[PDB]
Design a protein around this ligand. Structure first.
Ligand SMILES: *[C@@H]1O[C@H](CO[C@H]2O[C@@H](C)[C@@H](O)[C@@H](O)[C@@H]2O)[C@@H](O[C@@H]2O[C@H](CO)[C@@H](O)[C@H](O)[C@H]2NC(C)=O)[C@H](O)[C@H]1NC(C)=O
Ligand SMILES: *[C@@H]1O[C@H](CO[C@H]2O[C@@H](C)[C@@H](O)[C@@H](O)[C@@H]2O)[C@@H](O[C@@H]2O[C@H](CO)[C@@H](O)[C@H](O)[C@H]2NC(C)=O)[C@H](O)[C@H]1NC(C)=O
Ligand SMILES: *[C@@H]1O[C@H](CO[C@H]2O[C@@H](C)[C@@H](O)[C@@H](O)[C@@H]2O)[C@@H](O)[C@H](O)[C@H]1NC(C)=O
Ligand SMILES: *[C@@H]1O[C@H](CO)[C@@H](O)[C@H](O)[C@H]1NC(C)=O
Ligand SMILES: *[C@@H]1O[C@H](CO)[C@@H](O)[C@H](O)[C@H]1NC(C)=O
Ligand SMILES: *[C@@H]1O[C@H](CO)[C@@H](O)[C@H](O)[C@H]1NC(C)=O
Ligand SMILES: *[C@@H]1O[C@H](CO)[C@@H](O)[C@H](O)[C@H]1NC(C)=O
Ligand SMILES: *[C@@H]1O[C@H](CO)[C@@H](O)[C@H](O)[C@H]1NC(C)=O
Ligand SMILES: [Cl-]
Ligand SMILES: [Cl-]
Ligand SMILES: [Cl-]
Ligand SMILES: [Cl-]
Ligand SMILES: [Cl-]
Ligand SMILES: [Cl-]
Ligand SMILES: [Cl-]
Ligand SMILES: [Cl-]
Ligand code: NA
Ligand code: NA
Lengths: 526, 175, 175
C-alpha cells in the first residue's frame, strides 16, 4: 500500500505490473480548485488541504470539449476522443513513478495537444507507465481547460482574461515543483514535452516569465507557438468573445455583464456555439487559443523570439513526414479515408479555399504556383500529395524549423528530428503516410509491449526514441550512446542538420524543406 | 562467402559474417540475401571508389561523388537485384531522352539532368545543372565527405556513404 | 585466452590472436609470453584508462597522463614480468626516500620527483616539478594525446600510447 504525503494532503496510488516489474501510478490527483460557478473563465485558484487520504486510483474527468463525430466507430479518429466523463471539474494530474521509489529521478511532464479545443491526459497513447518502468523517469501529465472555457478572452479583464488553460498547465508545473520530491522526483530536472497544441504550449512556457523557474528543458513534437493556428490576435479574440455572447443571448453593453451572463450558461450551450464564433473555419481552426494577455504572455511572441527573450536552455524539436494529410479528410473536396483520394487540379484549388479562407486570390495562386510545378505532370497522385504538403509545411513543419532556427541563434543547443515511420497498425489509409500524432505512441513506448502486435523493427525504433528522449531530459543531449547509433548533431543556423527517425537506419541530413519553407516563411506572410 | 572469398582464412570470412549479419532485426527473411549483395558491392566497388576519392582529393583537387539510386523501369533483371552495376550507363549516354523508347517521363528528366551535369563537368570542371533550380553538387573533401544522390524524385546532399562498412573493408579486412 | 576470456566467442578469441601475433618477427621465443601479458594489460587497464582520460578531457578539464616504466630494483617477482601492476605505489608513497632501505640512488631521485609532482597536482592542480629543470608535463587532449613517461633515466613527452592496440579493444572488441 503506497501513500505519499503531499503539501495538500495524502494520496494513495496503485501498483502496476509492467514488463515484469512494477510502476506506481497516482492517477487523478487534483492540483487546483474546481473552476466552477464564479471561477468559470478565471485563472485557476490554488488548492487547500484535504485530510483525508485522497485515492488516486483512476483517471479524473476530462475538461468539457466538443468531440470528433466524423467517423463514428473508427479507431483512427475515436482514439483521440476523451475517455473519461467530461466536466468543468477536470483540474487533475497523473504521476507515474518507478518501483522501487526513485531517489532523485528526472521528471517528464506531458502537455497534450488537440488544437487548444480538445484533448485529455488519460488517453492510452499518453500512458506514462512504460517510460517510468523502462527509463526510471517520473512522468507527470495534467488536464487543462480547452475551448472557450480555457481560452475565452476579454482582454485586461480578470473575469475572462485569456490563457486560463495555459495558467492551468502552469499551476500544474508549480505543483511538481512543490510536491515531486515527495514521490522521489528531482524538481531541478524537469523536462516539458508536448505534441501539436501541447508543443505550442511548451514553446510559450519557454517565453513566459512565470514558467521560467518551473522547468529545465523542453521537447516540441509537431508544434510551436509561431504556427499560424497557435496564437489568437486581440482583434480576433474580442470579435469571438462578442460573437459567442451574441450567440448565447449574452450580449450586454457592460463587458463584465457579458461574462456574468456566460457564467450562467450551461457548459453545453457554450460548446455548441464555439464552432460559429467565426464566419468561416478550417479543419485547423483554433477558435479559442493563446492570446497576448499581458500576464502569461507579455508581448507578441514573435517579437520575444526574434529578440531573444525566452528561457535559455536546450530544446528538442521535430516533425513527421506527412503532417498535413490527417486534416484533408475533414473537408477538402475529393478526399476520403476510404479511397486513394486521387483529386484533380480543380479539386486542389477548391482545397486551398477550404484551408486558406481569405487569403487573396493572389495568395492562393502563389501556393498553387509553388506547389504544382511537377517533375512530372504524369503521376496521378500529384495534386493529392501537393495539398497535404501545403497543409503540413504551412501549419507545422516550416514554423517548427523557423522556431528552432531563431531559438538556436541565441546560443543554445537545439536538436531537430524528422520522423518518417508509418506505424504497422495505422488504421488510416496508406496514402495518408506518416501522419500527424503518430510518433506519440513511439515516444511513450507502446511498441515496447510485445503482446501488442507492433513489428520487431518497431520495438527497436521505440526503444531507441525512448532512450534518446530520456537522455535529453536527464542530460540535455538526445544520444543513444550504447548501440553504435547515429550521433544526433545540434541544429545551427547555417547547417541546419537534423536526424531522421525510421526503422531502417537514421541519417543526418540538412535543410529540411529548404525551398518550401523559404516560400511560407519569407514570402507568404500576402 | 566461399564463392567470393576463395582464400581468405576462415577468420577472414567469419569477420565479414560478423560485420554484416547483426540484424535489426533477425525477423526479415531477405536478410541474408541483402547482406551478400552488400558484401560484394561494398568490397568490390563502393569502398574502393570512396577511398580513391578521399585520397585523390587530399592533394588539393576538386572531386565530386555521386550515389546513383534509380532502378530503370525497363530493367530485365528481377526486383530483388535493385539498382544494379552497369545500369547508370544508359542514363549517362542519354538513351531515356528518346521518347520512342518506353522509359518513363521521370527517367527522361533524370537522364537529361545527368547528361547536363556530365557535360558541364567535362567543359568546365563542375558538374552543376545551373538552370532548373537544381541541387548544387558540393565538392567531396576528406572531413565531410559530401555526395549527391541521383534518383527521379529529388536529389540530396548526404555525407559519409557506407561509413561503418568501409571502415571494415578499408581499415581492417586488408586478414 | 580461454583462461582470460571465458566466453567470448571463438571468433572473439581468434581476433585477439590475429591482433597480437603478427610478429616482427616470428623468430623471438618470448613472443607469445609477451603477447599474453600485453593482451591482459591493454584490455584490463591501459586502454580503459586512456579512453577514460580522452572522454573526461573532452568536456574541458585539464587531465595529465603518465606511463610508468621503472622496474623496482627490489622487485621479488622475476625479470620477465617487467614493470608490474601495483609497483608504482611504493614510489608515489615515498618509500625509496628512505636510504636505510636498499633502493638505488636513481630510485630515490625518481620517487622524490613523483612525490613532488603528485603533491603539486593536489595543491595546485598541476603536476609539475618546477625547480630542477624537469620535463614539463603537458595536458592530455583528444587530438594529441600527450603523456609523460616516468623512469630513472629521463622522462619523455610522447603521444598516442598503444594507439593500434586500443583501437582494437576500444572500437572493435566490444564481439
Ligand atoms: C467578427 O464577426 C463578424 C460575423 O458576425 C457573426 O455573428 C456571430 C454571432 C456569428 O454567428 C458569425 O457566424 C457571424 O458572422 C464577421 O463579419 C461577417 O462577415 C460575413 C461576410 O458576409 C457576414 O455574413 C457576417 O454576418 C459578418 N458579420 C456581421 C453579421 O455583421 C467579422 O469578419 C468578424 N471579424 C473577424 C473575422 O475577426
Ligand atoms: C473517394 O471518395 C470521396 C468521398 O466522398 C465519398 O466517399 C466515398 C467512399 C463514397 O461512399 C461516396 O458516396 C462519398 O460521397 C469521393 O468524393 C466524392 O466524389 C463523389 C462522386 O461523385 C461526389 O459525388 C462527392 O461530391 C464527393 N464527395 C465529397 C463531398 O467530397 C471521391 O470521388 C472518391 N474518389 C475516388 C474513388 O478516387
Ligand atoms: C537531486 O539532485 C539535485 C541537483 O540536480 C541536478 O542534477 C541533475 C539531476 C540535472 O538534470 C540537473 O537538473 C540538476 O542541476 C541536488 O541539488 C539535490 O540535492 C538532489 N536531491 C536529492 C538526492 O535528494
Ligand atoms: C480508497 O481506495 C482504495 C483502493 O481501491 C481502497 O482499498 C481503500 O479502502 C479506499 N479508501 C476509502 C474508504 O476511501
Ligand atoms: C459594469 O458593470 C459591472 C457590474 O458589476 C460594474 O461592476 C462596473 O462598475 C460597470 N462599469 C461601467 C460603468 O460600465
Ligand atoms: C541496444 O541493443 C540491444 C541488443 O543488441 C537491445 O536489446 C537494447 O534494448 C538496446 N538499447 C537501446 C537503448 O536501444
Ligand atoms: C530544365 O527543365 C525544362 C522544363 O522546365 C526541361 O525541358 C529541360 O530539358 C531542363 N534542362 C535541363 C538541362 O535539365
Ligand atoms: C632537486 O634536486 C636536488 C639536488 O640537485 C634534490 O636534492 C632535490 O630533492 C630535488 N627536488 C625535487 C623536488 O626533485
Ligand atoms: Cl492505440
Ligand atoms: Cl487554372
Ligand atoms: Cl511524371
Ligand atoms: Cl525536403
Ligand atoms: Cl526484424
Ligand atoms: Cl550508407
Ligand atoms: Cl624475429
Ligand atoms: Cl605503444
Ligand atoms: Na511570389
Ligand atoms: Na575484426
Amino acid at each position: 500500500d503506497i501513500i505519499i504525503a503531499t503539501k495538500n494532503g495524502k494520496v494513495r496510488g496503485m501498483q502496476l505490473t509492467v514488463f515484469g516489474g512494477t510502476v506506481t501510478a497516482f492517477l487523478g490527483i487534483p492540483y487546483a480548485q474546481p473552476p466552477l460557478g464564479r471561477l468559470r473563465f478565471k485563472k485557476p485558484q490554488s488548492l487547500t488541504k484535504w485530510t483525508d487520504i485522497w485515492n488516486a486510483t483512476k483517471y479524473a474527468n476530462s475538461c468539457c470539449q466538443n468531440i470528433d463525430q466524423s467517423f463514428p466507430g473508427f479507431h483512427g479518429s475515436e482514439m483521440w476522443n476523451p475517455n473519461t466523463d467530461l466536466s468543468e471539474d477536470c483540474l487533475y494530474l497523473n504521476v507515474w513513478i518507478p518501483a522501487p521509489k526513485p531517489k532523485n529521478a528526472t521528471v517528464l511532464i506531458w502537455i497534450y495537444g488537440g488544437g487548444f479545443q480538445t484533448g485529455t491526459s488519460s488517453l492510452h497513447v499518453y500512458d506514462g507507465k512504460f517510460l517510468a518502468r523502462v527509463e526510471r523517469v517520473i512522468v507527470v501529465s495534467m488536464n487543462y481547460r480547452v475551448g472557450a472555457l480555457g481560452f475565452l478572452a476579454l482582454p485586461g479583464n480578470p473575469e475572462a482574461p485569456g490563457n486560463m488553460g495555459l495558467f492551468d498547465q502552469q499551476l500544474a508545473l508549480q505543483w511538481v515543483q512543490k510536491n515531486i520530491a515527495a514521490f522521489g522526483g528531482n524538481p531541478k530536472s524537469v523536462t516539458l514535452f508536448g505534441e501539436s497544441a501541447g508543443a505550442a504550449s511548451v514553446s510559450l512556457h519557454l517565453l513566459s516569465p512565470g514558467s521560467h523557474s518551473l522547468f529545465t528543458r523542453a521537447i516540441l513534437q509537431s508544434g510551436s507557438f509561431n504556427a499560424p493556428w497557435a496564437v489568437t490576435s486581440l482583434y480576433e479574440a474580442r470579435n469571438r468573445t462578442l460573437n459567442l455572447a451574441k450567440l448565447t443571448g449574452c450580449s450586454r453593453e457592460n463587458e463584465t455583464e457579458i461574462i456574468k451572463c456566460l457564467r450562467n450558461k450551461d457548459p453545453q450551450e457554450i460548446l455548441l456555439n464555439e464552432a460559429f464564433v467565426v464566419p468561416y473555419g478550417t479543419p485547423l481552426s483554433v477558435n479559442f487559443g493563446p492570446t497576448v494577455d499581458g500576464d502569461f504572455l507579455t508581448d507578441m511572441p514573435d517579437i520575444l523570439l526574434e529578440l531573444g527573450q525566452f528561457k535559455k536552455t536546450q530544446i528538442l524539436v521535430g516533425v513527421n513526414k506527412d503532417e498535413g494529410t490527417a486534416f484533408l479528410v475533414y473537408g477538402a473536396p475529393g478526399f476520403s479515408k476510404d479511397n486513394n483520394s486521387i483529386i484533380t487540379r480543380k479539386e486542389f484549388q477548391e482545397g486551398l479555399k477550404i484551408f486558406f479562407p481569405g487569403v487573396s486570390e493572389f495568395g492562393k495562386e502563389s501556393i498553387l504556383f509553388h506547389y504544382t510545378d511537377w517533375v512530372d505532370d504524369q503521376r496521378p497522385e500529384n495534386y493529392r500529395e501537393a495539398l497535404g504538403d501545403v497543409v503540413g509545411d504551412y501549419n507545422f513543419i516550416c514554423p517548427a524549423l523557423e522556431f528552432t532556427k531563431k531559438f538556436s541563434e541565441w546560443g543554445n543547443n537545439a536538436f531537430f528530428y524528422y520522423f518518417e515511420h508509418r506505424s504497422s497498425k495505422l488504421p488510416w489509409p496508406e496514402w495518408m503516410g506518416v501522419m500527424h500524432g503518430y510518433e506519440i505512441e513511439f515516444v511513450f513506448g507502446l511498441p515496447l509491449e510485445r503482446r501488442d502486435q507492433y513489428t520487431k523493427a518497431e520495438e527497436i525504433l521505440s526503444r531507441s526514441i525512448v532512450k534518446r528522449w530520456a537522455n535529453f531530459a536527464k542530460y540535455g543531449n538526445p544520444q543513444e550512446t550504447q548501440n553504435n547509433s547515429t550521433s544526433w548533431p545540434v541544429f545551427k543556423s547555417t547547417e541546419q542538420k537534423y536526424l531522421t527517425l525510421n526503422t531502417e537506419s537514421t541519417r543526418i541530413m540538412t535543410k529540411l524543406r529548404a525551398q518550401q519553407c523559404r516560400f511560407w516563411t519569407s514570402f507568404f506572410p500576402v
